[PDB]
Structures are given as C-alpha cells and as structure tokens.
Amino acid sequence: RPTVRPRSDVTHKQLSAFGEYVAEILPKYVQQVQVSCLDELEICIHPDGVIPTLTFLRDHTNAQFKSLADLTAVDVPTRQNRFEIVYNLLSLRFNSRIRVKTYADELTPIDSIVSVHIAANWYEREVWDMFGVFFFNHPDLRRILTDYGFEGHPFRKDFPLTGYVELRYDDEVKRVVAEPVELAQEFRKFDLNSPWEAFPAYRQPPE
Amino acid sequence: PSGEERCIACKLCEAICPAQAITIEAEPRADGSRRTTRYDIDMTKCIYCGFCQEACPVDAIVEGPNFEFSTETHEELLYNKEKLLNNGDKWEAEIAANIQADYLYR
Amino acid sequence: PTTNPPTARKFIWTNHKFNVSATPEQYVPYSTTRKKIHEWVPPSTPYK
Amino acid sequence: TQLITVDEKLDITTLTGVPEEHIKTRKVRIFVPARNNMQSGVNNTKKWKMEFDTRERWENPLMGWASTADPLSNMVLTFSAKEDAIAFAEKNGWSYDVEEKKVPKPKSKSYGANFSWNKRTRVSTK
Amino acid sequence: LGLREIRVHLCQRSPGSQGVRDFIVQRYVELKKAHPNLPILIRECSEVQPKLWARYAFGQEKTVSLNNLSADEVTRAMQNVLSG
Amino acid sequence: ASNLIEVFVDGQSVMVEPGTTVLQACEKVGMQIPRFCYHERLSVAGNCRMCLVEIEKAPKVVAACAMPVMKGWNILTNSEKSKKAREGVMEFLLANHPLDCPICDQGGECDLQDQSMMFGSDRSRFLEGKRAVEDKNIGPLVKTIMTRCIQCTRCIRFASEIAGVDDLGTTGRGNDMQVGTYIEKMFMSELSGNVIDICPVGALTSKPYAFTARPWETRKTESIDVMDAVGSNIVVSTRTGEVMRILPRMHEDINEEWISDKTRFAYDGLKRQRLTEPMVRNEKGLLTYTSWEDALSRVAGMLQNFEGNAVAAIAGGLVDAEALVALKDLLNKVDSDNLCTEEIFPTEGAGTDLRSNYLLNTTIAGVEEADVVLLVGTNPRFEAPLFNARIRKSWLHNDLKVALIGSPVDLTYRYDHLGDSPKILQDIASGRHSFCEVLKDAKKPMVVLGSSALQRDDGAAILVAVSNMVQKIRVTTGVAAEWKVMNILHRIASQVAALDLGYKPGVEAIRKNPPKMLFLLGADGGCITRQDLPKDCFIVYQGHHGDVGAPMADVILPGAAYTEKSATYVNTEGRAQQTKVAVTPPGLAREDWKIIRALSEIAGITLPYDTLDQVRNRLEEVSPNLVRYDDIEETNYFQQASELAKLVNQEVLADPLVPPQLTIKDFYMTDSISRASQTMAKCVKAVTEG
Amino acid sequence: TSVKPIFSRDLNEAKRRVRELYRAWYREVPNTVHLMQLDITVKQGRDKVREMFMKNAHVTDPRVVDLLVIKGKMELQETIKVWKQRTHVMRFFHETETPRPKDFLSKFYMGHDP
Amino acid sequence: GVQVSPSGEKITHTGQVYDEKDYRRVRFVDRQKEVNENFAIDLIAQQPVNEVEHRIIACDGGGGALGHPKVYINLDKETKTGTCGYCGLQFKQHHH
Ligand code: SF4
Ligand code: SF4
Ligand code: SF4
Ligand code: SF4
Ligand code: FES
Ligand SMILES: [K+]
Ligand SMILES: [Zn+2]
C-alpha cells in the first residue's frame, strides 16, 4: 500500500517493554503508561514525582535521556486539573524519545526541573507566562513572551484570540497607550465540523 | 471570453483564506445568476499565499504578476469588487498567458 | 508580443494606466451593500 | 502538614486578568448545541458548549465590514460534561444559564405500517 | 390604602401549601362572588413557598409568607388583607 | 427481561424492544448509520440503500433503516462488507449527481458531500455523460433544481404524511424517474419549507435564502418564535450582524423538527419598515426625528401631568414578559389599572384569575395521548400550524377522532363537521348528539376552544358554554382527574404572558373610560383609534415596526425585535421560554423594558429593577412561572372556574362562528413583521393569482 | 476543603506577605517617579498602588492571595529595573480612555450594553 | 452600462450609490469613484443563443480545464433556453 505508513512493531514492542520497566521502577509516581500507534512512549505521573522521574530519566544507566527537547502545557478546560504539562525528552545514547505528562490547575504549582535540565528555566518561564502555572524553586520566574504590563495568560482556552487591550499612539499624552480592543473586522469564526463522525475507533460510549 | 464574470459567489476562497482577508457578500442578480455584490480583499491583511487561486473552482480569483502597486495610503490597499475587476480587465493579456503556461502543472 | 500577441478580448483595457497613487485618479474603497435596512417614512398628512 | 481547609468557591477572576466589565456584565450560556436541521448527522451534539451573550456588531464606515467592541464574541468553549461547564463558569465568575440536553425521543418504526389493512398509516406512494 | 390586586403563589404538591390548596378548593368561589371586580391571581408552581401579595393604589405591595398554614388561618389572612 | 431482546453491535450487548430496527439499535449504542432516505419522523422508505450493514454469519447485507433485529444478531457496522456496500452506493449516487457544488446551497450542509467524504471512495470511475432534469416552478418559497435530486422520496413522504397535500410524487421509470408534480402545480401550504429542511441534497432550496450565505459563515443563536403562540424553537443563522436564515430546532414537546412557513420566511420583515429613531410630533403636526432625551422628557412630562385613570396602555402581539411587567409597574405607580391586551379574553368568572381557565391544559403531548379532540371555533391549520401538525400526527398514528364545531375549513385530516352554530355546545351538554355518544364511548376527551372564537361579542357566553360541556363530559366519562379536557388555543405570543402578569384582556376598559395618555406596546391591531379616542389623548407608540400604531402616535419609541432582544414569551401550554440576542436593534432602537425604565427615571417612578436579572426577579415575584424556562407545570381548580362561569349568566349568539383564517392567503399576513415582509407579499400574490 | 497550600497555611501570613509587598511598592514609588521622568507626583503613584491593592482586596483564598503576591513581586521587579517604560507604568492610570458611566440613563443613552 | 445618479456619482453593477445626504462622499471629493465599465450582465445578455441538437448539452467555460466544472443542461422546455449556472451561456434545442 503506497499511501499508508509502515508500522514498526519491533520498536512498538521495545517502547512497551521500557514502559513496563519505568512503571515498575517508579510505582510511587507513575499513574499511566501508554504507547501510541505512532511508536511514542508516554508516561503520565503524579505531580509530586516530577523531580524523581526527571532525575531518573536524566541519569539512569539504561535510561540516559540527558537532553530535554520540549516542555509545554496543554489547556484542557474540562478536567478538574486543567493544565497538562508535557516533557519531551531525548536519549542520544539509546536514540529514543520519551514523553512525561503531569497535571496542574490554576492554584497547584509544580516543582521546577531547572536543577535537572537548564533549558527548563526558559521553558517554565514560557509555561508560566502563557498558562499561569507557577513553578516552585524557579530562579527569576517571570514573563518571557508577553508585554511588560500584560494581564492574563493568553494561551489559555478562555482567553480571547485578539486579547482585551490594544495599543495605539496618542498625541495628546505623546505616548503609546492601551485601549479596550475594538476590531474593525470582527474575526469570523467558522463551524468547520462535519455532523458525521470520521473515526469509529475513537467513538466514545454514550453518557 | 463572453465577458461574464467567472466568480459564482461560492465563498470557498474566503473559507480557505488563512488571513480572513476576503469578504464575499452575495445575492442573486437581476437575471437570476449567482453572483457577488461585495468581494473585498484586504491586501494589508493578505499573506499572498495563492490559496484562493488554487481553491477557486472556476479560476475566477487569480494572483497576477503585478507587484509594483505600492500606495501612499492604507486605504488604497483595501480592494473591493470594482478594483479587483479593474485589475482583472487590466492584466488579462498576461494572466491568461500565464495560466495557459501553468495549468498543466496544477 | 510582436510575434506572439496575446488573445484579444473586448473587456481588456485598450489603454494601460500606471500607478495612480496620490493622484486625483486614485482608488477609493466603497461598501457595495445597498444599505440592507429600510427604516420608515412617516406620513406627510398630519394625524388622521 | 500539607493540607489546609479552604471554604471558598474557587475564585480566580483576580488572576485571569479579564476586565471587571467582561466578568460582571456578562452572561454565558451552557448548552448542547442543536442539531443542524439541514443535515441528519448528530456528531455536532454530545459536547457541552459554553458561549457568551452577543453584543453589538455595527457597520464599518469605510468598507462596510462588521465591526465589534467586545472580545468575548467568538468564545465557544467545549466541555465533556454539564457539571464541568458549570464549575468552569463558577470558577471564572460568570453568570450562567444552563439548559438541559434535548435528546430525540425513541420512536416506534415499522416498515409494514406503510401497507396497513385498516389503519391510516397506509401510504399511497413508495 | 385601597386594595387593587391579590396574588396567591403556591405549590401543587407540597405539605406546606396544603392549607392554601384547601382554601382555594373550598372558599375561593364565594370570595370571587363577594368581590367580582378584584383580581385574585392564583399562581401554582413547583418549588415555591406559599406567598400572598397585596398590591395597592400607587404600587405598594404587602408580602405575607404563609407556609405551613391551615385553611382557617389562610382565610383569616385573606380577610385581613381585604379589610385591613 | 420482559419483552426486551439482546442484540450485539460490534460485540456490544444492548437490549432493545421488539420491532426495533438495526439503525435504532446502532444509534442506541451510539453509532449513526449512514442514511439518505430514512427520517425518524417519516415512514420508512428503504430505497437509498446507504444503510446497508452486515449481520454476522449472514451472507446478505440488510437495510438498517427497515430491518428489525430478531435475536442475538451481531451487527458489524464497520466491517469490510459494509464499507464496500457504502462505497458502491455512494458511487452510484455520485455517478449521475451533477457537479454543482460551488453554485449550490448545501455548501457545508450537504449530507451527500459529508457522507461521501466519510464513507464513499475518493474517485469516480464514471466515464459517461450525466443525466439532466428540467426544473419546476413549485412556488415562490421552494426553488427546485431537480437535476441534483437523488430520488429519495423524502419530500413525497413528508407532503403525504405530515403536510398531507399529496401533490408530490414520482413520474417515470428507471433513470428517467422524476420527482415533483406532473402538472404545473403551485405547491403552497403551511409547513412547506420543511421540504427544504429535509431534502438532503440541494434539490429543494430556499428561494429567499438564495445565494446569500454559507453554513460555516453563519453564527447560530438558539431562540424561540413569535407571531405564533405555539412558541416553536428556532435557530437564527446570522452573519456579520445580519439575520440570514431561520431554521427549526428540535423540541419533541412543541414543534418536533419543523416550523411553519410564516416563521420560516417572515424574517424578511425585520429589515423593512423598522423604527430606528425616536420621533415626536412637530409644530406642523408631522412626525420628526428627535433624541431619546427629548422624547422621554415629553413622555415623562405628560405622565407627571396625568393621574391614574387618565393613563392607559394597550399591548400587542409581539411583546415580551419583561416589557409587560415594566409597563404594568409604571402604570401601577401612577395608579393606573388600564393595562389591556390587543385581543379579547372573557373576564367573567375566574377569567384571568385561575390559570387553568386560559391555557392549553392538555399539552401537545396531550394531543399525542388523547383519543377524541373537539375543536370549537378555530382553524388550527392557520392559527397554530404546529398544533394542527401534531393533531394530524395523532390522527395518523393513534387513530385520533377529530370533530369541528364552526365553519368547515380545509384541515388536512378528515374530521366530523358537527355544524356551524354555537347551539351545538348546549346540545352536547344536554346530550342529543352522535358526537355525544362518541364522547360517552371515548376515554381521553380533549376540547380546544379558539381565541378567535373568544374574539366574538359573546366570548363569555361561548366560554361558559364550552366549560359546561366540559363538566358534562368529565362527569359522563371516567376521566382520571390527572387528564384535563378544557384547552384554549391562543394565536398571540404576548397573550398568555400578559394574562399571567394580570393584564385585563381586551380594550373594553379603554372604551368605558377613555384615557388622555395612551401607551401602545406594539399595538398595531387597530382596535383603538382617534375616532373612539378623545381629541389629543397623547399616544406614544413603543414598537419596532411602523404599521398602524405608529402613524397615529404623538411620540414614537423604537423598541427591539424578538431576534434583537433577550426576552421571555409564554406559549399556549403555559410554558415560558427565553429568546436570545441574535443581532442588535438597528439605529437608536433600544430594548423595551430599558425604554420603560429610563422613562420612569426621567419621570419620578423608582422602578426597582436595573438589569435583566432584576427584571426576571420582578417577573418571578409577580408570577413565579415566567422564570421556570421550559417548564410545563400543571394547573388545577377548573371545577372552581367552571362553577364561577356557571354563575355567570349570558345567552349565546345565534351567529355561525367562522375563523378569520379561512384561507392560506389570510394566513400569510397576520402581524406587523408578516405585513412588512416582501416574501409574504409574494406568497399572497402567488396564492391569489390563477 | 483540604487543598494544598503554596506558601501560606492560612490568611494571616498571606496578609503578612501582602503587607511586605505593599511596603516594597510604597518605597519604590518615589524612586520610579524620579528615575522614569513621570508627569505624576509621588502622592498619585502611592494612591494608585493603594487603589490596585484595594481592587484586589476582596479575596479570602490563601492560594489566590499568594499568587497575587507573586505577580505583584514580578511587576515590582520589572519596575525596579527599567524593563517597564513610561508607557508601561502610565498604563495603570488610563489617562486616555473615557470611563463608561455607572448609571442606567447614560448606559441607555449610548449603546445596548448592561 | 454605467448610469449617473442625480447626485452625480456613477452607479455600479450592483447599484449602491450614496444618497444626497450621505456623508460618505468626502472620500470621493478631490478623488474619483471607479466603476468597472464592462457590466457582466449586459455582456452576457448580448451573447447569442447556441443552437444544439441533443436534449442534453454539456457546458464548460470554453476550455478543457481552463473553464468551469462540466455541467449538463436539459433543453426540454421549448419556451425558454437553458442557461448554464456557471457561465451565462444559453442553449436551445434545434427541433427542426
Ligand atoms: S493569497 Fe491572500 S487572499 Fe488569497 S488565500 Fe492567501 S492570504 Fe487569502
Ligand atoms: S473567487 Fe472563486 S472561490 Fe472565491 S467565491 Fe468566487 S468562484 Fe468561489
Ligand atoms: S447537493 Fe451536495 S453534492 Fe449535490 S451539487 Fe449540491 S453540495 Fe454538491
Ligand atoms: S427533492 Fe430532495 S427530498 Fe425530494 S426525493 Fe429528491 S432528494 Fe429526496
Ligand atoms: S436509509 Fe435505509 S435505504 Fe435509505
Ligand atoms: K435542501
Ligand atoms: Zn457554462
């Protein structure tokens, strides 16, 4: 089939075995281990075990994931803990990638892993700036991408696309001033959802 | 070639427009044909990606070869249907030749 | 376009115009809308 | 040592950065969206949408576009459960109106009723 | 001064509105015979307390809560509203 | 497991009733089988063949829309055989379907397009020429491009069963088989845009909604309907701050899936003849534009000048509960009880007092579960088309027995016309009738009295005669006392809310004591005019359309339309419902209760509400059922209302009562919006023309 | 009920942190006005600081008070540096925009807004 | 064909002219309001009707892929010519 990708069940099995390995090494923190059909290993842990899990994966002999590729957050505002913090880690020794997930809400911070990876400094600054997830023991935790006086965390789902304020030059005060946003166009939302389901494999059971 | 406008008010170019730069208000004409009354393209909002011209099913909207159309005011780059039809009438001797040279690839 | 002239059409501009910015012949946008709303006309006869 | 007793209602409106106008003078609607009657598909139901009350959209003097003044106009939020939507609205401090899911009623369907001997369900055209 | 309107808000299925229901079912008709120009609006709802509203001349409304009242005392309250 | 059978779909083990189809079992588990001709409110056709599914250990695919599950079946919805069947059927449809998708109207609304993308193949093997069918001229509402029809007979089944006109059908055989009328027929009935709804392809499109918008463009606001006291749920599809389309919603207890032609196509009137600025009389006597400050200052000055009985108010059809309680509070604060409605309800006995005396006590589900229905003095087809549609549905399925007292009008179903005279009510109450022996053989009686019948001079006499007949019916039959019999079918959206709020119905108080300051909350009916009014009388007209109440007004206050304000309306059942803001009112128009409150505070009336929620609290403290939205809570004390009516002594008139709505041409224009719409003008022109 | 604190066990030490932050802002206002050539006076800036604390002064959740203290410390840090400019520090005053009136008559005279 | 309003400004092919009292003509003061002279409705009205022989005629825009999607028009009504929906070309069956 020239239009469908190959599967690589061998690396799927390898990632499953390593998921069993990590889940039995750290039962105190690991809540779920899954391997996708795209051959990616995800380990979902309790927020209290971020430091031990990341330290184990940084320097364990069979699990050398010394390079932190990505640290991001996903706002799913329908679960109780609305932020899913995702760490994508790279193993140069074993040529592998792992994903570690934890959760947070607006009032539950997560311990920073700057003591484990130094890139987590700016990555956690970005997570705090864009989602409002505080990080314990972070050196100079502050905004990194928003404006200096910016209010609110714009990557949240409840934040508007255009924001609440906009800037313009005012000649009376001779400044760049902020005003409530007034669009001359009003971005048109499109309901691009077919009323027929596309993937029966993901059909949720009825409520 | 009869002179009738190619656009049939189907709006899928503004559906695919990644910058939302097109506004395609439309109504039936006096002869009952499905045509547009407002076709605005904000050239200060457009990203010049050609998605409209590759989405158009009748080759109505095109991105012709004119690039020396810089203006001295912001308003002159807010095109309407009259401006776009004037550009189509102005550049048809070149746009048609380019589409002739290009349409077998697309 | 002396050995291969373009296809002649009746709606093609016979005279080319250069960039007409900052000239009286420049382009000004409209709103081709026909107002979409007709308010009312009060009667010219007073009361009944 | 790490658990404290808090008897509040989980108010984060001082942290969200929303102006007080768009917190107090705002009405959100929590609802399963109605099936689009032009189609028979039902996949656009079964997710609880939260939307805001529609404000003024006036006409641009220059181009005739639809100008707006409120940012929470296209604020469709998706929730897997009505209680989750209620909790999110209460947490952000918006007044809400929630309406129940309108499931279609189960209906008795029989092909043989179209050819009844005495009932009025007999059709005159296939 | 000057009674203009009486409103009786009650519930259909509640133990607290039982006296109001009995009052309506036994002596509302004679009351309407006695005052055949006075609007006595009866409103029944699902989960409301028994309430009596007396609207007077310039919009003054007197509110009487009467949950868990029997027939004699609700008709005595009605006569109190009518007389003064 | 009494009369429950276990059936499997993809291994899941759902229990279903006997007679349940494969499609119903699959949707009970959660899977929607593809379909084109099946509709859950239409008879099973089984001709589109898109619902073919595989049963385990069965060599032949079965049509899920028609096949009932037997026992222990395993429905393999996602099997290779089912997917091949769906691909083949989709290929056969798209072989001769015309490639008209950009010039079409089902852009994102096409079931054919969506089911093609989800279940069909990605290519075509068709190397031949496609067929083409000449178009029809079925009416000014439904534009027929019949080349893209897929011969699914859904419109035929609808027009035969629900609309019941039997004008559509199939002519020809094979690939030449065509849908429509064989002759040049003007298919114009009420409930005729629902073929535009149920047609999955764009064969039957809306002519007023011709080429204006696309579904991905349209924002959808779920609201309710006015200009019909059924209060059907609708969706207003707007775009860029402009109402583009009115679609129906799904409420199984009010309107099911469809709406009527007037509510579907009367949105054109919302952009014609619209009050946009406040107006005052000039020194020359003409209406001229002014500001809100000046207009409300003049009204406040005259209101401070005039005392109680000299100030009166009349409320028309399209008025919300919030504005009604606002004007009631204002006039009560200036000590005025003259708060009248446009149409008349008899105030004798427990007229406005007991809520069971003026409601559809047995609901539309009551029509579903009744067995005999006696319609007195009404034309339900034009007064309440959804109510008549439910009567026909019960007549088809539950074998409902329908009788009519009044003029013989062409109701779709066949009824027993008992005659045209109000003496039949006394005849039935005494007991002399074939319908009386029908009633004594019956078990679920339901009588429906028309508000149009109440509009006569002997409205009180008609009401007491009907109530006495109800008492005789209830003592003759063994009714369970949870089953009501008496119902009143209103035709005015504001009427039930006004009666609940305590408005005195009818303008007879205005006739008895002519005021000097008059308020007209959209009072366009022409019941009160300057002839039977005194000289000046200071008329203010708060409304959205300038039709009849505006040209005779001293001041004009532009209010909001029902698509322009978040408002409350109570239907014939007594169910209160809320409409949302789809667009804002044009010009300087404002919301109606806001106008009244600003008037009071420019005057000296301290109205205790400031926001919409405070108006709702005022509505609750006046009658606490106007805030119970979508609640159908019961009434009682009909015995008390009946004996008060029996005390009331009137003689019924010997005039044969006829409904004002005898024909669909009279149906199409009823209110200000319908009179202002050009689409309804084209409808009455097409009906009246030969 | 039974939540995890972030800095403060209860409201008292949260108020202590609030007082420390307010002391720091009150001390920093004159230096800010002197360093960034602000049109305002020292009294106006301290009144603005009090206004911000007062508009945040209705919350009784210790975690929310701690997060407000943290965000105030961040804002104070970028005011201690000159990361915020004159425009950024004058955005607190809203000198350009006209406030929407709080009365029903004005909100009725202009706009369909509650 | 372009027309002139009593105010003086030209009328577009969708007639949208500003009124006498409309303030939005200062945008044309010392400038011009450009209207495309070639009205497509007139240009397609002056196109002749194609006489064809079959009951069903297929229409493109004049090229294999440079035209519009290929549609089919049914010329059963002798009273009116069949117009393709994409172009404005009219076809009539040569029944002689
Ligand atoms: S080229 Fe411009 S107008 Fe066309 S789709 Fe891209 S952004 Fe939109
Ligand atoms: S330019 Fe083309 S894609 Fe855009 S609306 Fe017109 S026909 Fe459709
Ligand atoms: S009905 Fe559907 S498939 Fe047919 S032309 Fe219209 S959009 Fe295309
Ligand atoms: S016109 Fe529409 S509803 Fe009627 S048979 Fe054809 S496809 Fe079906
Ligand atoms: S849905 Fe069953 S054959 Fe059409
Ligand atoms: K359709
Ligand atoms: Zn063509």
Side-chain angles (χ1 to χ4, degrees), chain D residues 38, chain F residues 105-106 109 193 195-206:
Chain D
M38 307 300 297
Chain F
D105 283 332
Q106 309 256 146
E109 282 165 354
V195 301
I196 308 167
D197 280 334
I198 66 168
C199 184
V201 303
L204 305 176
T205 53
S206 168

Side-chain angles (χ1 to χ4, degrees), chain F residues 1 3-7 14-20 69-72:
Chain F
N3 62 270
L4 262 298
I5 50 182
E6 173 184 24
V7 289
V14 67
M15 308 286 168
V16 297
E17 286 82 11
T20 303
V69 286
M70 293 196 296
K71 180 61 170 54

Side-chain angles (χ1 to χ4, degrees), chain B residues 2 16 18 39 42 47 50 52 54 61 65-67 70 78 99 101 103 105:
Chain B
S2 60
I16 206 52
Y39 199 102
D42 190 6
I47 76 176
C52 48
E54 77 191 35
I61 181 66
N66 190 28
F67 51 89
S70 60
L78 268 69
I99 295 179
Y103 82 109
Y105 293 101

Side-chain angles (χ1 to χ4, degrees), chain F residues 384-438:
Chain F
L386 269 305
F387 185 71
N388 189 78
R390 196 80 65 115
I391 294 185
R392 184 181 161 80
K393 175 180 178 178
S394 309
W395 179 84
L396 269 185
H397 298 104
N398 305 319
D399 204 67
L400 186 72
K401 174 63 67 61
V402 182
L404 178 70
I405 296 176
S407 181
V409 294
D410 188 11
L411 298 180
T412 298
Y413 38 87
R414 195 160 312 264
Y415 54 90
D416 299 329
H417 184 240
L418 300 182
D420 191 12
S421 55
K423 300 296 188 177
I424 311 171
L425 304 173
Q426 280 92 4
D427 282 337
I428 293 174
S430 314
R432 278 100 177 94
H433 262 75
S434 54
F435 194 64
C436 182
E437 82 213 359
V438 161

Side-chain angles (χ1 to χ4, degrees), chain G:
Chain G
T1 64
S2 74
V3 311
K4 186 173 301 177
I6 82 172
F7 277 137
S8 309
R9 304 289 300 169
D10 49 77
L11 273 177
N12 286 329
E13 44 268 16
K15 291 152 78 73
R16 177 173 296 107
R17 286 179 151 83
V18 165
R19 283 185 292 267
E20 293 284 343
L21 178 61
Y22 184 78
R23 286 166 185 256
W25 264 110
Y26 190 93
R27 292 292 171 84
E28 190 36 54
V29 159
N31 287 113
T32 287
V33 176
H34 169 70
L35 180 60
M36 286 184 274
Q37 317 285 344
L38 294 190
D39 156 70
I40 71 172
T41 69
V42 179
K43 178 65 66 177
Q44 303 183 26
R46 287 166 165 180
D47 290 7
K48 177 62 64 179
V49 172
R50 173 180 287 272
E51 176 187 358
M52 295 294 120
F53 274 87
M54 279 303 119
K55 80 184 282 294
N56 280 322
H58 71 279
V59 45
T60 57
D61 202 317
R63 303 167 299 174
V64 186
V65 175
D66 274 335
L67 275 188
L68 287 168
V69 164
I70 291 173
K71 297 173 75 181
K73 283 189 192 301
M74 295 178 182
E75 201 76 24
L76 172 71
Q77 181 185 18
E78 54 187 351
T79 324
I80 277 267
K81 261 74 63 167
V82 205
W83 301 346
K84 296 175 71 71
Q85 304 298 281
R86 304 164 39 106
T87 79
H88 300 93
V89 301
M90 291 300 297
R91 276 166 206 180
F92 291 102
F93 292 87
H94 310 326
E95 285 197 342
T96 293
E97 62 189 67
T98 303
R100 295 196 72 248
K102 304 299 183 58
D103 51 305
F104 187 85
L105 266 318
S106 307
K107 295 188 301 182
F108 172 83
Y109 285 157
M110 50 178 199
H112 324 83
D113 303 309

Side-chain angles (χ1 to χ4, degrees), chain B residues 1 13 20-21 28 30 41 43 46 49 59 84 86 90 96 98 102:
Chain B
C13 62
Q20 286 202 355
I41 291 185
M43 311 291 284
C46 161
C49 73
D59 301 340
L84 292 171
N86 284 339
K90 168 156 67 168
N98 281 339
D102 222 335

Side-chain angles (χ1 to χ4, degrees), chain A residues 1-73:
Chain A
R1 299 181 304 182
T3 52
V4 193
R5 295 171 65 93
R7 286 205 166 176
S8 202
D9 50 351
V10 34
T11 193
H12 183 265
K13 187 53 190 57
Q14 288 175 354
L15 289 186
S16 297
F18 186 66
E20 297 145 27
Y21 181 81
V22 182
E24 70 195 350
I25 276 190
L26 308 169
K28 189 183 177 179
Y29 307 130
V30 167
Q31 300 177 340
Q32 191 172 300
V33 174
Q34 57 190 8
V35 189
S36 54
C37 65
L38 331 170
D39 307 331
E40 298 188 8
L41 171 64
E42 307 181 339
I43 297 183
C44 312
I45 69 177
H46 195 275
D48 285 337
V50 174
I51 293 288
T53 307
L54 258 300
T55 309
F56 171 74
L57 295 183
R58 187 197 64 179
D59 45 11
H60 180 53
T61 311
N62 268 10
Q64 312 174 22
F65 285 89
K66 310 198 295 299
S67 181
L68 167 74
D70 181 72
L71 199 162
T72 185

Side-chain angles (χ1 to χ4, degrees), chain F residues 79-210:
Chain F
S79 71
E80 181 79 11
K81 188 183 291 288
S82 306
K83 292 160 85 176
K84 276 187 167 60
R86 292 163 193 170
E87 287 200 42
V89 173
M90 182 55 61
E91 179 178 18
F92 285 142
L93 289 170
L94 300 183
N96 268 286
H97 195 67
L99 46 160
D100 275 334
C101 297
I103 63 172
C104 201
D105 283 332
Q106 309 256 146
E109 282 165 354
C110 187
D111 267 339
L112 181 57
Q113 269 183 325
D114 281 1
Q115 291 175 82
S116 167
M117 286 278 308
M118 294 318 180
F119 316 101
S121 174
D122 54 330
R123 276 174 201 85
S124 60
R125 305 181 291 194
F126 194 76
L127 307 181
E128 314 289 337
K130 297 170 176 295
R131 77 171 185 263
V133 180
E134 52 182 343
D135 297 347
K136 281 83 182 174
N137 198 27
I138 223 54
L141 295 182
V142 188
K143 180 177 66 178
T144 68
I145 303 183
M146 300 302 298
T147 315
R148 51 181 85 120
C149 166
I150 57 176
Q151 281 78 23
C152 88
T153 72
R154 230 192 247 188
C155 56
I156 302 168
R157 278 174 294 150
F158 174 82
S160 293
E161 299 151 17
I162 299 174
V165 290
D166 280 312
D167 291 357
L168 297 179
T170 49
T171 56
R173 282 218 304 252
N175 198 29
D176 297 334
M177 196 187 74
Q178 301 180 4
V179 182
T181 72
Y182 183 55
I183 61 186
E184 187 58 43
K185 187 66 169 301
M186 187 70 58
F187 168 62
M188 288 302 279
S189 75
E190 86 293 332
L191 316 161
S192 78
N194 319 329
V195 301
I196 308 167
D197 280 334
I198 66 168
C199 184
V201 303
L204 305 176
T205 53
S206 168
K207 194 169 300 185
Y209 183 71

